[PDB]
Design an enzyme around this catalytic site. Structure first.
Site, mmCIF file in Angstrom:
data_model
loop_
_atom_site.group_PDB
_atom_site.id
_atom_site.type_symbol
_atom_site.label_atom_id
_atom_site.label_comp_id
_atom_site.label_asym_id
_atom_site.label_seq_id
_atom_site.Cartn_x
_atom_site.Cartn_y
_atom_site.Cartn_z
ATOM 1 N N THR A 187 5.740 28.373 3.824
ATOM 2 C CA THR A 187 4.435 27.767 3.586
ATOM 3 C C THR A 187 3.311 28.684 4.051
ATOM 4 N N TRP A 219 7.305 -0.002 4.737
ATOM 5 C CA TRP A 219 7.798 0.670 3.541
ATOM 6 C C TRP A 219 9.229 1.149 3.734
ATOM 7 N N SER A 259 13.445 6.046 -13.451
ATOM 8 C CA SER A 259 12.413 6.716 -14.239
ATOM 9 C C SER A 259 12.216 8.158 -13.783
ATOM 10 N N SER A 260 12.211 8.389 -12.467
ATOM 11 C CA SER A 260 12.073 9.750 -11.954
ATOM 12 C C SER A 260 13.253 10.618 -12.370
ATOM 13 N N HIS A 298 13.830 13.928 11.542
ATOM 14 C CA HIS A 298 12.862 12.857 11.727
ATOM 15 C C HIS A 298 13.327 11.798 12.717
ATOM 16 N N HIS A 352 12.757 13.070 3.215
ATOM 17 C CA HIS A 352 12.183 14.384 3.486
ATOM 18 C C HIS A 352 11.980 15.219 2.224
ATOM 19 N N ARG A 375 1.953 1.461 16.007
ATOM 20 C CA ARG A 375 1.649 1.412 14.586
ATOM 21 C C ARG A 375 2.094 0.080 13.997
ATOM 22 N N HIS A 384 0.828 -1.199 0.000
ATOM 23 C CA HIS A 384 0.000 0.000 0.000
ATOM 24 C C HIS A 384 0.864 1.252 0.000
HETATM 25 C C1 HEA Z 1 -1.097 8.524 -2.006
HETATM 26 C C2 HEA Z 1 -0.927 8.408 -0.710
HETATM 27 C C3 HEA Z 1 -1.850 7.630 0.140
HETATM 28 C C4 HEA Z 1 -3.281 7.423 -0.018
HETATM 29 C C5 HEA Z 1 -4.232 7.919 -1.056
HETATM 30 C C6 HEA Z 1 -3.586 6.569 1.142
HETATM 31 C C7 HEA Z 1 -4.955 6.105 1.385
HETATM 32 C C8 HEA Z 1 -5.465 5.521 2.626
HETATM 33 N N1 HEA Z 1 -4.637 5.085 3.594
HETATM 34 FE FE1 HEA Z 1 -2.545 5.088 3.663
HETATM 35 N N2 HEA Z 1 -0.459 5.244 3.733
HETATM 36 C C9 HEA Z 1 0.348 5.979 2.956
HETATM 37 C C10 HEA Z 1 -0.133 6.828 1.870
HETATM 38 C C11 HEA Z 1 -1.500 6.882 1.354
HETATM 39 N N3 HEA Z 1 -2.543 6.264 1.933
HETATM 40 C C12 HEA Z 1 1.784 5.876 3.262
HETATM 41 C C13 HEA Z 1 2.925 6.559 2.586
HETATM 42 C C14 HEA Z 1 1.832 4.952 4.390
HETATM 43 C C15 HEA Z 1 3.057 4.473 5.124
HETATM 44 C C16 HEA Z 1 3.069 3.054 5.654
HETATM 45 C C17 HEA Z 1 3.504 3.146 7.090
HETATM 46 O O1 HEA Z 1 3.210 4.165 7.741
HETATM 47 O O2 HEA Z 1 4.190 2.220 7.565
HETATM 48 C C18 HEA Z 1 0.399 4.647 4.575
HETATM 49 C C19 HEA Z 1 -0.044 3.740 5.619
HETATM 50 C C20 HEA Z 1 -1.408 3.600 6.080
HETATM 51 C C21 HEA Z 1 -1.759 2.907 7.326
HETATM 52 C C22 HEA Z 1 -0.817 2.271 8.303
HETATM 53 C C23 HEA Z 1 -1.272 0.837 8.498
HETATM 54 C C24 HEA Z 1 -0.447 0.199 9.570
HETATM 55 O O3 HEA Z 1 -0.324 0.826 10.641
HETATM 56 O O4 HEA Z 1 0.299 -0.739 9.241
HETATM 57 C C25 HEA Z 1 -3.225 3.004 7.377
HETATM 58 C C26 HEA Z 1 -4.026 2.439 8.479
HETATM 59 O O5 HEA Z 1 -4.179 3.025 9.529
HETATM 60 C C27 HEA Z 1 -3.688 3.730 6.175
HETATM 61 C C28 HEA Z 1 -5.059 4.063 5.800
HETATM 62 C C29 HEA Z 1 -5.479 4.640 4.533
HETATM 63 C C30 HEA Z 1 -6.900 4.763 4.220
HETATM 64 C C31 HEA Z 1 -8.068 4.367 5.043
HETATM 65 C C32 HEA Z 1 -6.911 5.368 2.912
HETATM 66 C C33 HEA Z 1 -8.139 5.692 2.166
HETATM 67 O O6 HEA Z 1 -8.178 7.102 1.910
HETATM 68 C C34 HEA Z 1 -8.291 4.907 0.881
HETATM 69 C C35 HEA Z 1 -9.432 5.558 0.115
HETATM 70 C C36 HEA Z 1 -8.778 6.385 -0.950
HETATM 71 C C37 HEA Z 1 -8.910 7.703 -0.993
HETATM 72 C C38 HEA Z 1 -10.046 8.369 -0.277
HETATM 73 C C39 HEA Z 1 -8.031 8.434 -1.976
HETATM 74 C C40 HEA Z 1 -8.365 8.063 -3.404
HETATM 75 C C41 HEA Z 1 -7.125 7.521 -4.045
HETATM 76 C C42 HEA Z 1 -6.925 7.643 -5.350
HETATM 77 C C43 HEA Z 1 -5.758 6.930 -5.953
HETATM 78 C C44 HEA Z 1 -7.968 8.270 -6.240
HETATM 79 C C45 HEA Z 1 -7.705 7.690 -7.613
HETATM 80 C C46 HEA Z 1 -7.718 8.743 -8.692
HETATM 81 C C47 HEA Z 1 -6.695 9.581 -8.845
HETATM 82 C C48 HEA Z 1 -5.386 9.299 -8.188
HETATM 83 C C49 HEA Z 1 -6.763 10.636 -9.895
HETATM 84 N N4 HEA Z 1 -2.554 4.107 5.355
HETATM 85 C C1 HEA Z 2 2.451 15.407 1.360
HETATM 86 C C2 HEA Z 2 3.484 15.025 2.071
HETATM 87 C C3 HEA Z 2 3.896 15.765 3.278
HETATM 88 C C4 HEA Z 2 3.901 17.201 3.480
HETATM 89 C C5 HEA Z 2 3.519 18.320 2.568
HETATM 90 C C6 HEA Z 2 4.400 17.297 4.862
HETATM 91 C C7 HEA Z 2 4.565 18.614 5.478
HETATM 92 C C8 HEA Z 2 5.079 18.894 6.815
HETATM 93 N N1 HEA Z 2 5.433 17.909 7.663
HETATM 94 FE FE1 HEA Z 2 5.398 15.826 7.418
HETATM 95 N N2 HEA Z 2 5.484 13.766 7.033
HETATM 96 C C9 HEA Z 2 5.104 13.108 5.928
HETATM 97 C C10 HEA Z 2 4.521 13.764 4.761
HETATM 98 C C11 HEA Z 2 4.380 15.203 4.547
HETATM 99 N N3 HEA Z 2 4.676 16.131 5.475
HETATM 100 C C12 HEA Z 2 5.301 11.649 5.956
HETATM 101 C C13 HEA Z 2 4.974 10.642 4.898
HETATM 102 C C14 HEA Z 2 5.888 11.409 7.268
HETATM 103 C C15 HEA Z 2 6.298 10.074 7.838
HETATM 104 C C16 HEA Z 2 5.336 9.360 8.763
HETATM 105 C C17 HEA Z 2 5.937 8.005 9.025
HETATM 106 O O1 HEA Z 2 7.140 7.938 9.341
HETATM 107 O O2 HEA Z 2 5.178 7.018 9.067
HETATM 108 C C18 HEA Z 2 5.951 12.778 7.818
HETATM 109 C C19 HEA Z 2 6.490 13.014 9.148
HETATM 110 C C20 HEA Z 2 6.650 14.308 9.778
HETATM 111 C C21 HEA Z 2 7.244 14.475 11.115
HETATM 112 C C22 HEA Z 2 7.783 13.415 12.027
HETATM 113 C C23 HEA Z 2 6.617 12.500 12.354
HETATM 114 C C24 HEA Z 2 7.028 11.075 12.172
HETATM 115 O O3 HEA Z 2 6.902 10.583 11.034
HETATM 116 O O4 HEA Z 2 7.256 10.401 13.192
HETATM 117 C C25 HEA Z 2 7.195 15.926 11.343
HETATM 118 C C26 HEA Z 2 7.695 16.568 12.574
HETATM 119 O O5 HEA Z 2 8.814 17.030 12.649
HETATM 120 C C27 HEA Z 2 6.581 16.559 10.159
HETATM 121 C C28 HEA Z 2 6.331 17.980 9.956
HETATM 122 C C29 HEA Z 2 5.841 18.592 8.738
HETATM 123 C C30 HEA Z 2 5.765 20.047 8.650
HETATM 124 C C31 HEA Z 2 6.139 21.053 9.675
HETATM 125 C C32 HEA Z 2 5.244 20.275 7.327
HETATM 126 C C33 HEA Z 2 4.984 21.609 6.761
HETATM 127 O O6 HEA Z 2 5.875 21.849 5.664
HETATM 128 C C34 HEA Z 2 3.548 21.813 6.329
HETATM 129 C C35 HEA Z 2 3.561 23.022 5.409
HETATM 130 C C36 HEA Z 2 2.331 23.805 5.754
HETATM 131 C C37 HEA Z 2 2.286 24.644 6.778
HETATM 132 C C38 HEA Z 2 3.436 24.735 7.736
HETATM 133 C C39 HEA Z 2 1.137 25.621 6.800
HETATM 134 C C40 HEA Z 2 1.623 27.053 6.864
HETATM 135 C C41 HEA Z 2 1.550 27.510 8.289
HETATM 136 C C42 HEA Z 2 1.234 28.764 8.589
HETATM 137 C C43 HEA Z 2 -0.092 29.292 8.140
HETATM 138 C C44 HEA Z 2 2.200 29.656 9.327
HETATM 139 C C45 HEA Z 2 2.040 29.270 10.781
HETATM 140 C C46 HEA Z 2 3.357 28.942 11.442
HETATM 141 C C47 HEA Z 2 4.328 29.847 11.526
HETATM 142 C C48 HEA Z 2 4.191 31.003 12.460
HETATM 143 C C49 HEA Z 2 5.347 29.917 10.440
HETATM 144 N N4 HEA Z 2 6.229 15.557 9.171
HETATM 145 CU CU CU Z 3 11.010 15.808 7.507
#
Ligand code: HEA
Ligand code: HEA
Ligand code: CU
Ligand code: CDL
Ligand code: PCF
Ligand code: PCF
Ligand code: PEF
Ligand code: PEF
Ligand code: PEF
Lengths: 133, 53, 59, 54, 45, 47, 102, 121, 534
Positions: free
Chosen positions: I316, I127, I157-158, I291, I241, I438, I62
């Site tokens: 942001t 993953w 590919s990327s 992280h 990141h 988790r 997934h």
């Molecule tokens: C694209 C990013 C993406 C999307 C869409 C989802 C969709 C969902 N995910 Fe998942 N998930 C991840 C990214 C994503 N996830 C990642 C990166 C992890 C890390 C594994 C880990 O943490 O170890 C994760 C892991 C993860 C866990 C951890 C399981 C565990 O602890 O082992 C769980 C369960 O709690 C969960 C739940 C869901 C559910 C309920 C949806 C539902 O929303 C599903 C229903 C779908 C949607 C509502 C979105 C529609 C999706 C589309 C593809 C639309 C198709 C058309 C277009 C793309 C144009 N996700």
């Molecule tokens: C779409 C992908 C995506 C995006 C955009 C982000 C965006 C951000 N993420 Fe996240 N993140 C993940 C995907 C993403 N992340 C994934 C996949 C993990 C791993 C989980 C796993 O390990 O299972 C993770 C994990 C992760 C962690 C560690 C948690 C962990 O995994 O155990 C933290 C904390 O340090 C964090 C922080 C942030 C912050 C601060 C932003 C910010 O950049 C968000 C940007 C937006 C805002 C910040 C809004 C703007 C705010 C304001 C309006 C200003 C207010 C504040 C000020 C005064 C400046 N992310």
């Molecule tokens: Cu990070």
């Protein structure tokens, strides 16, 4: 030939329903309207001013909004049907799967909270953890 | 002599850009040759004995 | 050299694929992939066919 | 004549490339190599000559 | 010539319905989990 | 590549032909999509 | 933001001066209503004169509706009343008393 | 069939008909008629004063009214050209869709454009 | 079809292949995550009788398909190769064989994952591939090697896609466009190209050494020899990141484009926003070990990392204020892409601010590796990938293919999927704040109702996806009948309320993107003479 006081069925037809008439007399009527407009206004009658306002303002085609003449009702009906279908499908699939758990029953929760009282855990909270029959 | 009804993609006229581009090309070639010769000279002068040591 | 211009003219006159450079090599390499890779990927799922089916159901 | 061809081939440094099978054959070769190595290092057959040929 | 507003009148009469509606929206969006908690046998009721 | 009108050639579909009224292909798309989860569940356990 | 009204105003009258057809009139009217600058009665009179030159009363209807409701302006009315009556009775373009009771 | 000097740009027929004779040993050939590809069409031109893919913008200062609409040279049926006001950047970045038969306007800029193609049979 | 489709060399004909692969992968992954959620509805083996390794492999599949196999081909590849060369005005991108080889190197990754899940070994290490759990000590079989080759091919590919984007943007850009007037989406994809270029090699090398350790009977990071997996986990976080920014920045570009066009007003200081994205891309490398607060590094290092995170948060917020100013003081038409954009600017902002709160150095003691972090990233993944893809599809589909979509169906679909996503992802933060673990197929009996509501929301979401694929079918089959009648909107731009509709015939579709001024999709080698801007 610069007809004067064009009081015919065309003006009431234009004000009533414009899109209905088959997009062919439109050029003729707008050409006549513009030809009248070339001469000074001289207090245009009600149907003519209404017709030119209807043509130039909108409420048709390009000016037709994304929200139709009551399709929001269809939207609400469809979303209600979607929620009903989703909940019904989840219910039937969960019934098909069944339950095979030896806990969540009342006796387990009562024993759990009895032991919690004995050990005095989470005093300032909720000792009852049942969540199911 | 291929035919051309109106214009053979004449574009901009023969302005001062031609000699400017020629000067740029010759300056680039002279710079490359001069830097190669200078690096060779400084290598055979000091760099090569130091590398050998 | 003495063959570049003539070969370019021939290629322009005869706009054909395979680029005329290695036809024998292409004809040698085309069947090799089909003979080799397909026959080596078929066992990958053919052998575990009897292995597949481990339900490991417990109650 | 010259102007039209110059405009039609000037900003187009890309040839009218034939249905070249390079991507599919290279992808097929990489997949065969990957699955062969995976099956050979730890699997059912320890063959080495044919994976070398791949 | 300051005709009518006196900002306060229209300001209040326009934002008060909007802020009430937004507060009701937030109350519903926070009470639906509360509605679920009430409906579920949280206290064996 | 310049022999295509620019209407339906951009998709690997074909309205013409009674073999598939875009329904066999659409059902097949569902089939190939739902393959991996159900087969993954079935190969080591029950659905 | 400390921008003089006179320069853009005079630009507006100069643009309406050479109003050959309705296109430039419409674009300049849209530009004038684009700013928060509430149009003066003089530029409104110039716009109505140009509309009379191009002979499109519905454009006058549209501009009158825009003046009636363009910005809140703390809900000012008597300013709108004078700015409409002066240009209604300067030459005479009767259009408002018809679409409202329809 | 043989090498072509192609000293002038108005005497070359066929992009691949010219390869560019070189030298095996001795001195480097001059960068005039020894390049493979259509690169000579631009390099010899800029050696003699001919540029390729001009970046010169159209007459932004001229408003292009009906009396003297601006002229863009494009032998194709359609064109993608517009106005950005009298200076370089004044209003929103915009462009039009001129065609062979009718004309187009720049809307808020009001700059009427016209498509002027070269005569074709 | 083999002669032109399987052997294509055209960006125009390959973008649709990217889109088809993306939608197929997305629907398969949604069904598979449906399975994952359904077996977790109640504690016990409700649907997965034992074999928790199967659940782990399901989770790995997934996550991997969502990250590298669904969204990467869609907005990076599929949208980039059909928008960037089109907006430039160049006839074709440079050397499309790069695009073709990048496309064709995907599918064997899918087949290797499916055959790895088929075998009894499986890849059940999450993953993340942190050693030694992925080595021969715990997980044997070719599954690990297949996953490694799949990630390698996706990375190649990327990289090839980034190569093509960079060369097209820098070497053969049109004369009219310059540095000071370049649009937003192409800047977003170019910055993403920089980040991808500077991020791929570290993962490639580190995973190569992991494979070498698994094969050559050695260990650089495993303890069997004196190595430490913390170094590899630093490298993996250093890659990971920038990946979220890679997947979120083209979303930022397309959302900026749609809000700028739907507000009927120009952008709000395009220089400021492009500086904001450039700063985000440059600052994404200063938190390489942010992280991994769980080890117990020096307090100065943790303070530096949290300072870097709070610095990263600022652009942001500035960019969010930029969209807010863009939508402020402008005409609004409630069309579906605007609904997607609004849902983004709300829920993505809430998720990002929750992550900013989580970005504290000492706050990982209660939230890290719990349901709180999954509730965090699911928010942003849904907002910037799912909803962004839906907005882009409903925003260019009527012209890139000439086929319209039912507006009522689009509205009901957005409503259904929005409410489903909300009701799924909201309770996960309540699970995380408690401190639940988790990646466990079975959980204690404390939060059963939240799992049940997540399950019903998942069913709502999958029904929404079924409706969406039905919408795709209807658009592909009844576009001509929908165009003539009032079933859909044929002009996303209603005329200004000063102008007549008869003049509007010449003013049909006018915006700041050239492909909208184009007619029905022409031949691939269109754009005979490049566009010039005065
Ligand atoms: C694209 C990013 C993406 C999307 C869409 C989802 C969709 C969902 N995910 Fe998942 N998930 C991840 C990214 C994503 N996830 C990642 C990166 C992890 C890390 C594994 C880990 O943490 O170890 C994760 C892991 C993860 C866990 C951890 C399981 C565990 O602890 O082992 C769980 C369960 O709690 C969960 C739940 C869901 C559910 C309920 C949806 C539902 O929303 C599903 C229903 C779908 C949607 C509502 C979105 C529609 C999706 C589309 C593809 C639309 C198709 C058309 C277009 C793309 C144009 N996700
Ligand atoms: C779409 C992908 C995506 C995006 C955009 C982000 C965006 C951000 N993420 Fe996240 N993140 C993940 C995907 C993403 N992340 C994934 C996949 C993990 C791993 C989980 C796993 O390990 O299972 C993770 C994990 C992760 C962690 C560690 C948690 C962990 O995994 O155990 C933290 C904390 O340090 C964090 C922080 C942030 C912050 C601060 C932003 C910010 O950049 C968000 C940007 C937006 C805002 C910040 C809004 C703007 C705010 C304001 C309006 C200003 C207010 C504040 C000020 C005064 C400046 N992310
Ligand atoms: Cu990070
Ligand atoms: C279960 C079957 C559901 C079929 C729904 C058909 C409803 C309809 O006419 O079209 C709705 C809609 C088309 O409507 P439209 O053309 O937009 O007409 C509306 C008008 O513009 C404007 O017309 P209106 O707004 O007056 O019409 C709305 C009005 C009342 O509106 C509604 O009730 C809304 C319903 C929309 C959602 C459909 C749920 C049912 O009429 C209905 O829709 C009838 C209600 C009862 C239908 C129950 C079936 O879409 C469909 O045609 C079906 C939608 C998808 C539902 C599933 C399709 C059947 C699947 C069969 C099983 C296949 C399994 C997979 C195999 C592999
Ligand atoms: C805990 C979960 C609860 C869940 C509760 C669910 C309640 C049922 C669903 C309600 C959803 C509200 C939107 C409905 C969709 C819609 O069409 O809304 C716009 C309609 C406009 O009216 P119309 O539906 O187009 O009909 C017009 C009839 N003519 C004009 C000919 C006389 O206008 C309306 O529908 C009325 C205005 C909407 C005001 C929304 C604010 C909330 C207060 C509504 C009070 C009346 C309705 C509720 C009465 C019980
Ligand atoms: C035609 C075939 C109809 C089949 C009807 C089946 C009804 C049924 O099975 O009971 C109602 C279900 C029971 O839910 P269940 O999950 O199957 O059983 C409970 C299991 N425990 C609590 C031990 C975890 O309860 C539910 O599914 C409740 C669904 C959630 C409530 C929806 C409310 C919608 C408006 C808000
Ligand atoms: C159970 C019911 C569940 C809800 C069903 C809704 C059915 C459709 C209702 C409808 O479409 O409402 C239609 C009404 C008006 O219709 P009308 O009166 O003008 O039609 C009259 C002529 N026939 O507009 C609305 O409501 C608009 C409501 C906002 C829609 C855009 C939402 C954007 C995203 C919001 C979320 C983002 C976060 C914001 C902060 C929280
Ligand atoms: C839809 C939501 C229903 C919620 C629900 O039905 O919930 C179940 C509750 C009681 O079950 P319970 O909560 O005491 O079980 C607690 C421990 N599991 O009510 C009902 O059975 C009402 C039954 C309604 C049946 C509707 C008809 C369905 C078609 C039947 C055809 C045969
Ligand atoms: C449909 C709209 C989208 C879903 C909203 C509800 C999701 C939360 C939920 O479905 O909550 C479900 C909880 C049950 O929790 P439970 O543990 O008792 O279920 C175990 C026993 N089945 O309450 C409800 O059944 C509420 C049911 C509706 C009550 C109002 C109508 C009464 C008549």
């Amino acid at each position: 030939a610069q007809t004067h006081a064009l009081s015919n069925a065309a003006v009431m037809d234009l004000q009533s329903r414009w899109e209905n008439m088959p997009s062919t007399e439109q050029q003729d009527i707008v050409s006549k309207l513009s030809e009248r407009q070339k001469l000074p206004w001289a207090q245009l009658t009600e149907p003519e001013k209404q017709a030119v306002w209807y043509i130039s303002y909108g409420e048709w085609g390009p000016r037709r909004p994304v929200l139709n003449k009551g399709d929001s009702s269809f939207i609400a009906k469809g979303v209600a049907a979607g929620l009903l279908f989703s909940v019904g499908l989840f219910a039937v699939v969960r019934m098909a799967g069944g339950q095979d758990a030896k806990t969540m029953n009342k006796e387990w929760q009562l024993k759990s909270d009895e032991y919690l009282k004995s050990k005095n855990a989470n005093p300032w909270g909720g000792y009852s953890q049942v969540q199911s029959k | 002599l291929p035919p051309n009804a109106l214009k053979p993609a004449f574009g901009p006229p023969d302005k001062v850009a031609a000699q400017k581009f020629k000067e740029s090309l010759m300056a680039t070639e002279k710079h490359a040759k001069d830097t190669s010769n200078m690096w060779v000279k400084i290598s055979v002068w000091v760099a090569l004995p130091a590398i050998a040591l | 050299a003495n063959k570049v211009i003539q070969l370019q003219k021939i290629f322009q006159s005869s706009t054909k694929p395979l680029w005329w450079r290695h036809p024998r090599s292409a004809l040698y390499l085309y069947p090799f992939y089909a003979i080799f890779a397909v026959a080596v990927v078929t066992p990958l799922l053919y052998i575990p066919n009897a292995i597949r089916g481990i339900k490991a159901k417990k109650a | 004549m010259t102007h039209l061809e110059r405009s039609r081939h000037q900003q187009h440094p890309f040839h009218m490339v034939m249905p070249s099978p390079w991507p599919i054959v290279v992808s097929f070769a990489l997949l065969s190599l990957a699955l062969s190595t995976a099956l050979t290092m730890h699997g059912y057959i320890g063959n080495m000559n044919m994976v070398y040929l791949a | 010539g300051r005709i009518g507003e006196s900002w306060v009148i229209t300001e209040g009469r326009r934002l008060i319905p909007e802020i009430f509606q937004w507060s009701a929206v937030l109350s519903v969006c926070l009470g639906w989990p509360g509605a679920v908690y009430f409906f579920s046998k949280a206290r064996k009721a | 590549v310049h022999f295509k009108d620019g209407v339906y050639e951009n998709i690997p579909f074909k309205v013409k032909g009674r073999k598939t009224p875009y329904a066999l292909s659409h059902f097949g798309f569902f089939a190939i999509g739902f393959a991996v989860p159900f087969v993954a569940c079935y190969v080591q356990l029950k659905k | 933001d400390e921008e003089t009204f006179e320069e853009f105003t005079a630009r507006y009258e100069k643009e309406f001066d050479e109003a050959y057809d309705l296109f430039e009139v419409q674009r300049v009217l849209n530009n004038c209503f684009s700013y928060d600058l509430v149009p003066a009665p003089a530029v409104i009179e110039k716009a109505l004169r140009a509309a009379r030159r191009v002979n499109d009363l519905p454009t006058a209807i549209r501009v009158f509706e825009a003046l009636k409701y363009k910005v809140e302006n703390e809900d000012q009315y008597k300013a709108y009343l004078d700015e409409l009556k002066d240009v209604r009775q300067e030459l005479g373009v009767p259009l408002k008393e018809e679409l409202f009771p329809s | 069939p043989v090498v072509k000097t192609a000293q002038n740009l108005a005497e070359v027929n066929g992009p691949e008909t010219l390869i560019g004779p070189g030298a095996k040993e001795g001195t480097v050939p001059t960068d005039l008629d020894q390049e493979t590809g259509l690169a000579r069409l631009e390099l010899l031109g800029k050696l003699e004063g001919i540029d390729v893919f001009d970046t010169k913008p159209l007459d932004s200062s001229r408003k292009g009214t009906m009396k003297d609409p601006i002229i863009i040279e494009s032998y194709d049926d359609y064109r993608y050209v517009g106005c950005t006001g009298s200076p370089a950047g004044s209003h929103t970045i915009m462009w039009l869709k001129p065609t062979v038969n009718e004309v187009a306007r720049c809307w808020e800029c009001g700059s009427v454009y016209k498509l002027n193609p070269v005569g074709v049979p | 079809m083999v002669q032109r489709w399987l052997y294509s060399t055209n960006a125009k004909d390959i973008a649709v292949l990217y889109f088809m692969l993306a939608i197929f992968s997305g629907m398969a992954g949604t069904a598979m995550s449906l399975i994952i959620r359904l077996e977790l509805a109640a504690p016990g083996s409700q649907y997965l009788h034992g074999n928790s390794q199967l659940f782990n492999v399901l989770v790995v599949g997934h996550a991997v398909l969502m990250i590298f196999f669904l969204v990467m081909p869609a907005l990076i590849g599929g949208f980039g190769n059909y928008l960037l060369p089109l907006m430039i005005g160049a006839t074709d991108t440079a050397f499309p064989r790069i695009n073709n080889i990048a496309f064709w190197v995907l599918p064997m990754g899918l087949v290797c994952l499916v055959t790895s899940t088929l075998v009894e070994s499986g890849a059940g290490t999450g993953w993340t591939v942190y050693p030694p759990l992925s080595s021969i000590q715990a997980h044997s079989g070719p599954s690990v090697d297949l996953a490694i080759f799949a990630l390698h091919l996706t990375s190649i590919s990327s990289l090839l896609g980034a190569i093509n984007f960079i060369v097209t943007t820098l070497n053969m850009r049109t004369n009219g466009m310059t540095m000071h007037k370049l649009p937003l989406f192409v800047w977003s994809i170019f910055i993403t190209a920089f980040l991808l270029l500077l991020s791929l090699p570290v993962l490639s090398a580190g995973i190569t050494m992991l494979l070498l350790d698994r094969n050559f009977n050695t260990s650089f990071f495993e303890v069997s020899g004196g190595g430490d997996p913390i170094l590899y986990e630093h490298l993996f976080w250093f890659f990971g990141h920038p990946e979220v920014y890679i997947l979120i920045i083209p979303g930022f570009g397309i959302i900026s484009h749609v809000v700028s066009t739907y507000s009927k007003k120009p952008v709000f200081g395009e220089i400021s926003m492009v500086y904001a994205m450039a700063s985000i891309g440059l600052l994404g490398f200063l938190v390489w070990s942010h992280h991994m607060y769980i080890v117990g590094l020096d307090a100065d290092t943790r303070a530096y990392f949290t300072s870097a995170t709070m610095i990263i948060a600022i652009p942001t917020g500035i960019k969010i204020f930029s969209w807010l100013a863009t939508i402020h003081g402008g005409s609004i038409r409630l069309a579906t892409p605007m609904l997607y954009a609004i849902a983004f600017l709300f829920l993505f902002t809430m998720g990002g601010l929750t992550g900013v709160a989580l970005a504290n150095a000492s706050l990982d003691v209660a939230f890290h590796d719990t349901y709180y972090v999954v509730g965090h990233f699911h928010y942003v993944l849904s907002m910037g990938a799912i909803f962004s893809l839906f907005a882009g599809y409903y925003y260019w589909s009527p012209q890139i293919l000439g086929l319209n979509y039912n507006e009522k169906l689009a509205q009901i679909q957005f409503w259904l999927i929005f409410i489903g996503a909300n009701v799924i992802f909201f309770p996960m933060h309540f699970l995380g704040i408690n401190g639940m673990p988790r990646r466990i197929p079975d959980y204690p009996d404390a939060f059963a109702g939240w799992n049940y509501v997540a399950s019903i929301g998942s069913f709502i979401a999958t029904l929404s996806l079924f409706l969406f694929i039905y919408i795709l079918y209807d658009q592909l089959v009844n576009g001509l009948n929908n165009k003539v009648n009032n079933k859909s909107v044929i002009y996303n731009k209603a005329p200004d309320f000063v102008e007549s509709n008869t003049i509007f015939n010449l003013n049909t579709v006018k915006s700041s993107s050239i492909e909208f001024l184009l007619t029905s999709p022409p031949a691939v080698h269109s754009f005979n003479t490049p566009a010039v801007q005065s």
